[PDB]
Amino acid sequence: EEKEILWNEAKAFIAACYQELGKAAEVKDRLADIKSEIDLTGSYVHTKEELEHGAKMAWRNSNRCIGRLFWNSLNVIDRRDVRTKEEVRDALFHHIETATNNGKIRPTITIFPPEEKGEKQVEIWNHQLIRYAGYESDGERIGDPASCSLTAACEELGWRGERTDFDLLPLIFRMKGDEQPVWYELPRSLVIEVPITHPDIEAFSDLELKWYGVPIISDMKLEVGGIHYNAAPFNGWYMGTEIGARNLADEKRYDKLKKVASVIGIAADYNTDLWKDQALVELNKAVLHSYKKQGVSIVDHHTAASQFKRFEEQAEEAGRKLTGDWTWLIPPISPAATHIFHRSYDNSIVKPNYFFQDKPYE
Template sequence: MTNTNDMWEEASTFIYTCYEELGLCREAAEARLLDIQREIEDSGTYGHTQQELEYGIKLAWRNSNRCIGRLSWQSIRLVDARDAGSAEEVAECLFQHIRTATNHGKVIPLLTLFAPRTPEGVDPVRIWNHQLIRYAGYETSSGIVGDPASVAFTKEAMKLGWEGNGTDYEVLPLVIEIAGQKPVYVPIPKDLIMEVDIEHPDYPEMESLGLRWYAVPMISDMRLEIGGIQYPAAPFNGWYMGTEIGARNLADPFRYNKLPAVAKVMGLETTSEASLWRDKALVELNVAVLHSYRKNGVSMVDHHTAANQLAKFEEREAEAGREVTGNWTWLIPPMSPATTHIFHKSYSNQVKKPNFFHQPAPYTKNQDDNLPEKKFDQKEEANPALATCPFHG
């Protein structure tokens, strides 16, 4: 159940901040708050205006402590889908999100917003997927095929009737749950899915590994909170930072674990750790990822440029009189972190709102919906930098 006192306090803080930063007078903010107060008294909640939502999602990005790509926080676009009430309507909105965000590789930061949580605590819409586009994972007698991070969700999709092919890079269907109804799976049209085959400019043998990844990280399982209103379905995206794919998704031992295979095609000696074969393979895999995305015209940022962009963001925030908060363990890139300024400084991890919050997957039990951030888990995929922060994948 919603605590209306807390909602009112959160609404007041947000409206004053929003109106001030938009250059609107305090009298206008106070008049708006009177309307909000009446709404809360009458219904136990209130509705945001389009302007409030458009600025609220920008603030949520700016406040994302895990995101290295916050320099572009003002660029995110909003699609207001609060009226989508059926699984079919939600699916169509998600298809349009994928189409618009991908933009033939010129990625557009985008957030599609569905109906908020009711005063009774009911979520009108939930998207079960961690990301709108992600690869399936299958447990087999000889090990896991595909993405190990997707094994649990893949099982749930199959329980609903989806039939996968059991291959390494198979895109999962969307799973949509409407309040009071059974969840349904909806395959994503293949023409909406942009993928990149990974090749290396100097090691053509790497192409034989058949590595690939999807173009855009679109996070779909986080809860957005703006002014005390909870939006449990608010998929959003930025663009990838190369290391999220090359140093994590394809490289982590508990993900695709491709470093040994990369080392082999490079002809590296792997019998001794002192040869630093893992490091050499890691660098070249990341070179391949950056090269392949660039060759295919897909937006991506390297981790050094991303770190420089964060430094610029920090400068601009200081000029605006705002402290930059951050989660150091997530801001440092997973490759060569000591070569960036981030490694050598500290950040307050204070959580500001509006913001994105983790919430339990509908198919899991005994998880806490109120934690602003999970404790750092090395087995968890790095968030996307609107350059899966929440904004890189």
């Protein structure tokens, strides 16, 4: 009964994949081998070409992603060969190193062995390979609240954070057959961070803000032709607003707008002064300026939206249906200044794609 779902998704995927690669004639024979493989083993194994293209298709189908113009240049790393936690660890270290690329970020995915009987071979606990810890204890708020539960979970495993506002969480994942995950401290040499300064307001440094260079989502499931890659961390480069308008701005995150208003020399007393709006703009300018000055890749929301429009045009020219989530595609500052705001998007789910998974902690 499980073969049936796998087999149908496999047919849809290979037919569409090989079609796009111009391998339309090799479908029938490839489908046969897969049909046999499923019969024998209860599953099938992707060729490196299918795996690579499937990961690209999945990115192209990510309704919430504004950066999809570059779907076809994704660097896919096939690590389905890993069997030990040392190999997982070094694969994760390598992903960080190669995707970072000394600041000139390469969009990269590292693909680990897929679920077998729904049984995970590797289970990554981190939301992102690089992220800051969070602590709350009796009035105290330190670090990133979005990381509070994972941080508490790590401190159940013998790890202890310094309790600065920017503790790097260790990598934490569990191997099949083990009851507890293991954790490895990140080598600081691998992690680029960017101190946030303002182009012309020098007092901005007094906030002592910083953020990490590369956002590497590590807790989503990649689904390709019925195959479930629960462990397949991926990264692009940041859009400035993700850091300046959300991570550093949200009240449930770092909540820095009042402090920003102070250092840029404006009052934070009256809603009608639009001080939050003004602080958001200056904070987002500082973020863009800082990453650029540091030689770390980043994109502003206007350029990103322009690129996304080219993605829309490209899709129309190629005869492909466009899907998107309007509510996530619009940037959280000046959304009406982008074309995205003024059109509609079909939020249908197309596979291959990336999906949410339940968290092993909490």
